[PDB]
């Protein structure tokens, strides 16, 4: 008697083609799958990041923890005084905090930038803060994204020509003046009989800064706005002019009349505008009309050694007080910065603007320790190289890639039968 | 029909592993049983299925990086990396399904050995998982012993 | 020798799958037929090369997106690409020449367990694509029928 | 008597190697092949793409389909008009057509400025317009690569300073004058007594035009050139000049022949030169000599979205007139854009110059549903990942690479014998 | 237990290829000697060694072109690239040792096959590496002659 | 009787996994590992290089080849005269070796440099050569690491306007002057009565050179520096200016000191300055005080049809000769440059300077036929796609991968024992 074991599959059963085997299964599994998406900022490397922010992640604060956004841990990890703002450090605005900015990190998380909003009611002949404050923060995290390490500059080397000259001061600044730039006025031009003379001045950016390298230095070459000449001749003989040169000549900077269109807004009177610009270390020339000269006083130095696309965190107040959505812009037109961006309106335990439960839950990524990638979509842990959903760009690390749930491969599984050969 | 090959059955009629014995009066007329206790194939199964999760991890573990500093989405270089990737996976997994077939197909060729050496022998082997027993050295119950079924 | 070798042949000799017999008056002299009517193992090898197309159609499928605005050719990346995609074909290769080997090792083992089981239990298996049969048994037109040459 | 199936093989059979068992056959069939490639143009996405032309992609023309060198479907595709060229639109020459392009595609297919060729015989002054139309064009392209969209800004608002200043005249310019850029003269100008007062002018380009985004503009910084000042001082007192400034007062374009030689030719009289720039939308200056003044009045406006690189048609007539090779030339040393070229003298069905046999071959791929790639040696479809010979760049899409035919890997055919272990 | 199957020993006790024999007076004991002549085992094994040199050839043939004109080390980048290499690399060793494993399991069912023949039909094959030898039949001078110990 | 072969491992046997198949094995083997890497210069193509030297690398020097630190047959693949330099050909100072280097090669290699150290006490007004040196050498390596070919254009098509005007002598330059830049002196102008008339003139940079081809021109814009306007009143009247234009007036190079600050150093007196300028090719027009006026004269002629990262070998003198490191830090601050140092001081076969061991180990690469990449860690031949330690950038070729020897996979050895199937 012939004895056999007999092999036999039903219709439920489907052949999986194998090289060097086939297998039937009535079953199959997904061989892999996605990877979560977190919203929020955190970092790939805990050991080479850095934090620049205000009150909502500085550890010193009276009423930390309840006033901080980030966990202790995180904190220490953080450059940060309460009331600063980098933009409030560029400038040194009268009575408001004047924070000395500095640190080294590859990875770089900007949560910051509040302090200085329209609720702050900076006048200083300010022609428009909030646009001021988007081209500023646009230079910096320009810079940043290159740079290894970050450094305000509290002091720039300066001299100016004149003897006569005085130094600035305005009502609508506080009855003072900004740290920079410098104000200097000459108290005899007077458009009677005297002109004056063409002020001259110059300002040094460092090679370096303590510890830090400079390659790069945002500067604002900062100029007078008046409506038309006729207003102008109000205070000085002639066009207005600031201009600002480099080493050689080149004109780099400044607002010319002679040449360009006047742009003041009707009946404003005067203002000051304060472009902000990249520049390379060295020394830099001004010239401008007799009675007023602006001079930079302050920079930002930056490296070029190199850095991660780096994290601008949103910087609004609470819905009681007058925000702007500057820094959001200026990150979105700069190439290499990812937002972050609450959904919900900002309340502090603390108080009304400090210690908030949704920003709390975005940051709490930057306490991680298995984060290989970061991405304008949130970031992720190294479970499979795939999600559902595109990460979106800028983005850095083991990033994961998008590919319809369809195309990942199956496995068998259950009952399992081999074939091989062609069984006819 | 033995072990070498996979035959299709209609409507109900399980799938899986049977016992089929053949002729006796001449001609005889077929005959499959209902599955006996064939738990070291489903052990061994079991096992196999396990093992591939070391192939799995290690394409899981490999992740490319990246540094994109625009802000708009390259969908078609994205699209590109993704299909180059779902590639690499398709050819591990063609691996992977030979893998379990060449391992359960040998499994199922050292289940058939033990019954040989059982009755031993007394089996006669006709090609793998098929014997020749002379229903004269074997009784009914010596056939449950070496075959048990 | 039965399956699990190949011999070569000198000068002119045919080439292929044939039927070759032993000993009779002690000692024999060998002898090998001009191939018989294996017309299972045509039939398979033209399944075998047809299901070649499957792996091919997944190579053939994929092909990189790029994106170039550079006026001169970036020779040598050119090159290296090639090389690249040359190289995962000559893996594919090797795994379809494999599996085609297997395939037809296999259909080959499933062709001499038909002769087995059709001369039962006269043929008595010794190894693959080899039989012993005792010339008492047996004709020349039972082996005949189990061998059919 | 053992009886045995023998393999055997002849010096015909070669051994195969395989991961997992070897093969012994007699034939090979390579495992895969070449792509053909196609010359002419085509497109990957039939449904995100954008024609600019004239008559021969012009459906409304009275002679199509004699007329066209494409079919109906695909001329539905173009924005064209009889008569018409970017280049006439970009300036609006005296009794030319002037067509109003504009369209969105990620794939371009410019295949237009025949029309403004050496045949036109348009003077107006100009100085050499198969240099100003390479110029120009180049720029185009350059703009149009990085661009989604394109549109014609038919209208720059524009205000002069002067108000004794009257539009520009000349007999050269059919008694008229370019729609771009304007013409304003100070009558009483004359090297007797009077010089005259500097003239000024500011021209703005929008931040969009109807439903496009412009985030950059290709104008005209036209100025006159003379041979030498003695030759200028005819017209006007001191050096000509006529320069360009942006918002601040950086000189951008335009003559000073304060600080610049004179190079008109000799004899040859007044030329004008209108070198095209990419230039950001915003409010620009413009200062010149007191009796002429030319404003620029008309752009192209372009996103920077994104776009493929872009294809170039040949724009020639019949060999009976005039034509010129300056959008080949303006196309190949651009970046990202790819010309398609005749090898025969264009003969058109409808006349002379339009619906010509071997265009239509060319441009027949404009049509297709199953192009995956574009390159400067033409098109293909995804039937394998190779191609004989190198696809030339600028490409895009999914691109076949070469490799020498001997490096295509074989697979065994004809009698197959397999073999496993060492058989010894 | 016969070539489908390896086993462990613990303590001393050399491991390799063994013949072992079962019973004799009902029931028996088992025993396993210390390893006969397999000279041709070795000399396959040296055989299939050898034969790998050419898919380690085939990789390491293959390096891609680059070209960076940076100054400083792209490290990320640089350790992604070697990972991926590392992970083909890893695929290929899995198809190298696999192809050993297959080659060398084929090339003992090729000494096996020596062994059936010699005795034959004698032998009565149990499974690869195993056979059935009635004691009546077979001396032990047979046995050493079909055996060789 | 059942006989059976029996199959056994020990505790010294591993399971090695495969696809198909494991095998058991008591020893493992590496499957590939490191390609050792050489420091020094080489070539990946011996085809396509080219050499650009001084006496080092001479053959025809009188002591070859005692004086070579390279073998004929590598020698014969440079351009080199002894005594020459890239810089001392540029501006060609009195009794300088004044040799027209040219040639074309993919890969380049400059071995020169030495021949105007500060051991050659060139004076010539120069406010510091090194300087200028360093400065010079960047502008070279950056239009060279673009280019296929570099020939020295060796006399600029200049025109002057000035009739009085006439040639420029030093007691500091050998009582004669550079042949670049030239030197034009009004003798009328004196501090007295007299001003003069401010000095023009035009240079033109060619499209072509002989059989090469000109898409990009180093050239040097000098100018003349004091310390203050007083300083310079001892001369001319009015401040000091030298300004470099393009054709259309735009601002290119010099120094104008109507806006910059004086940065003469202190009673040190007239200084000249020699900035380096990549400038496309055309015509360019100066503008200078009457009584002084500098006018390039020479250039260096590069294409833009590509080329390999470059490679830089150290230049310096024996112990004994006062050396500098300027083409060091050129090659270190620009892209694409890889530098060859010496770990050891020059001790030359010759003489002193010529004919160094350490150098001929470092070079003989050079002369290799089998290497396949280069980089500034050294060369590597094409053994594994692996290396030990990084390969450090500049770098092209087929270049290896740095990895740990441990993720290197292993193959079973010794005795070997197949295993398949679950053997329970
Ligand atoms: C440095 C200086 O000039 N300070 C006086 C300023 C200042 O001169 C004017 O603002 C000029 O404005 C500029 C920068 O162009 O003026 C001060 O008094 C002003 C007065 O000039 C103005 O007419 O009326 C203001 C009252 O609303 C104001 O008082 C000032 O701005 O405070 C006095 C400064 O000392
Ligand atoms: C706007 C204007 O000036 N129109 C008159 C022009 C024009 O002034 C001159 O071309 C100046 O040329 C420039 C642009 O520098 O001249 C017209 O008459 C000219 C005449 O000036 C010239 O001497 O002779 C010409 C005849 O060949 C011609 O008539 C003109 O160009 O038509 C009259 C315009 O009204
Ligand atoms: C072309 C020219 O001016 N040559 C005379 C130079 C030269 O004018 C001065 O250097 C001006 O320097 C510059 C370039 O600004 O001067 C020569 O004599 C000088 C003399 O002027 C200076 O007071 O004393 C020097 C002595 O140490 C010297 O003699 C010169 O430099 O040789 C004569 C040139 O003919
Ligand atoms: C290896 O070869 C086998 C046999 O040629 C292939 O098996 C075929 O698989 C397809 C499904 O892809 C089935 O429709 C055929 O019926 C199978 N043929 C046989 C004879 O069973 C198998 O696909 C090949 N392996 C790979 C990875 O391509
Ligand atoms: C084909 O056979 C398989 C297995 O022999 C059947 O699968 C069983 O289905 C029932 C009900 O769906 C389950 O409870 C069992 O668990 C399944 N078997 C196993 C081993 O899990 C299948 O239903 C059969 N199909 C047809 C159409 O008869
Ligand atoms: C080796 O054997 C093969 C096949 O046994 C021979 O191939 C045959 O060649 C003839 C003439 O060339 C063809 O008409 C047949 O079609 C081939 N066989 C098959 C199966 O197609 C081959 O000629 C032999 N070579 C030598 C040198 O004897
Ligand atoms: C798998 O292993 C086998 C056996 O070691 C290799 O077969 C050898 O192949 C070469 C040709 O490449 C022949 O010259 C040898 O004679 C073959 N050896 C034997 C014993 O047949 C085979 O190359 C390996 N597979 C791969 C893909 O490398
Ligand atoms: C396990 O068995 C292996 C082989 O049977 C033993 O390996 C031998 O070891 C000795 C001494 O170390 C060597 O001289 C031999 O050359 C080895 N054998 C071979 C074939 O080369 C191993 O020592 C055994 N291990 C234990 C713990 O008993
Ligand atoms: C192919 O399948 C076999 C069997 O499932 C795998 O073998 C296992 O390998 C691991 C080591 O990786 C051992 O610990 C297990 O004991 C093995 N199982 C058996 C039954 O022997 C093998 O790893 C698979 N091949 C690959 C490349 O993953
Ligand atoms: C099954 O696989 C997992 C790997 O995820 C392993 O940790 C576990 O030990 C395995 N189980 C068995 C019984 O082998
Ligand atoms: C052979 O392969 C092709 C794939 O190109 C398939 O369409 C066809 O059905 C196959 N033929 C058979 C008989 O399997
Ligand atoms: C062993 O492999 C090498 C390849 O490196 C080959 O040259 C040699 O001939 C091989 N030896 C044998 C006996 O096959």
Redesign the interface.
């Known amino acids: ?13 489907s052949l ?9 299964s ?1 079953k199959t599994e997904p ?2 799958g996605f990877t979560n998406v977190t919203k929020g900022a955190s970092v790939i490397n805990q050991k080479d990041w850095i934090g620049f922010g205000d009150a909502r992640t500085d550890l010193t604060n009276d009423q930390f923890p309840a006033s901080s956004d980030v966990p202790l841990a995180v904190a220490k990890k953080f450059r940060s005084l309460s009331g600063a703002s980098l933009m409030l450090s560029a400038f040194g605005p009268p009575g408001k905090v004047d924070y000395l900015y500095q640190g080294c990190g590859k990875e770089k998380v900007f949560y910051e930038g509040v302090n200085w909003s329209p609720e702050a009611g900076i006048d200083c002949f300010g022609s428009n803060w909030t646009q001021t404050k988007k081209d500023f923060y646009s230079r910096i995290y320009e810079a940043a ?1 290159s740079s290894t390490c970050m450094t305000l500059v509290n002091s720039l080397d300066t001299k100016i020509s004149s003897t006569t000259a005085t130094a600035g001061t305005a009502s609508s600044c506080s009855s003072s003046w900004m740290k920079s730039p410098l104000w200097y006025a000459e108290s005899s031009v007077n458009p009677p009989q005297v002109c004056g003379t063409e002020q ?1 001045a ?1 300002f040094t950016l460092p090679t370096s800064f303590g510890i830090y390298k400079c390659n790069k230095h945002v500067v604002q070459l900062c100029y007078f706005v008046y409506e038309n000449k006729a207003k102008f001749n109000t205070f000085g003989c002639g066009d207005y002019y600031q ?1 600002y ?7 780099i ?9 006047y ?1 003041g807004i009707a009946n404003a009177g005067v203002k000051i505008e304060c472009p902000s610009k990249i520049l390379n270390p060295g ?1 830099y ?1 001004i ?1 401008s009309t007799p009675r007023f000269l602006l001079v930079p006083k302050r920079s930002y130095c930056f490296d070029t ?2 850095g ?2 780096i994290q601008v965190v949103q910087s609004e107040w609470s819905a009681s007080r007058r925000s702007d959505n500057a820094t959001e812009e200026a990150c ?1 037109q700069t ?2 910065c990812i937002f972050i961006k609450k959904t919900t309106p900002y309340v502090g335990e603390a108080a009304d603007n400090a210690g908030d439960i949704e920003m709390r839950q975005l940051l709490s990524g930057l306490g991680n320790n298995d984060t ?2 970061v991405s304008q979509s949130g970031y992720t842990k ?5 999600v559902k959903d ?1 990460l ?12 319809d749930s369809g ?7 259950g ?10 | 029909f033995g072990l070498l090959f996979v035959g299709f059955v209609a409507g109900g009629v399980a799938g899986g592993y049977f016992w089929g014995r053949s002729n006796g009066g001449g001609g005889g007329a077929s005959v499959s049983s209902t599955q006996a206790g064939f738990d070291k194939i489903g052990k061994d199964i079991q096992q196999l299925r396990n093992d591939t999760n070391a192939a799995i991890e290690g394409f899981n573990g490999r992740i490319a990086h990246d540094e994109q500093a625009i802000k708009n989405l390259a969908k078609e270089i994205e699209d590109a990396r993704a299909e180059a990737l779902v590639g690499e996976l398709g050819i591990i997994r063609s691996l992977i399904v030979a893998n379990i077939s060449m391992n359960l197909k040998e499994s199922l060729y050292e289940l058939a050995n033990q019954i040989t050496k059982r009755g031993g022998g007394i089996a006669q082997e006709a090609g793998p998982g098929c014997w020749y027993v002379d229903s004269e050295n074997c009784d009914a119950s010596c056939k449950e012993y070496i075959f048990n079924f």
Not at chain 1, 382 to 386: A, I
Request: glycine share 12%.
């Open positions: 008697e012939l004895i056999c074991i007999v092999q036999r599959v039903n219709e439920s059963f999986h083609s194998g090289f060097g085997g086939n297998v039937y009535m061989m892999t994204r001259s110059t201009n040169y480099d080493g050689n000549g080149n004109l900077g400044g607002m010319d009349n002679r040449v360009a269109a742009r020394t020339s010239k050694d190199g991660y696309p979105l190439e290499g290989v990638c190294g479970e499979t190289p795939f595109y979106s760009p800028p983005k850095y690390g083991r990033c994961q890639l998008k590919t195309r990942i491969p199956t496995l068998p599984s009952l399992i039968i081999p074939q091989a050969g062609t069984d006819s």
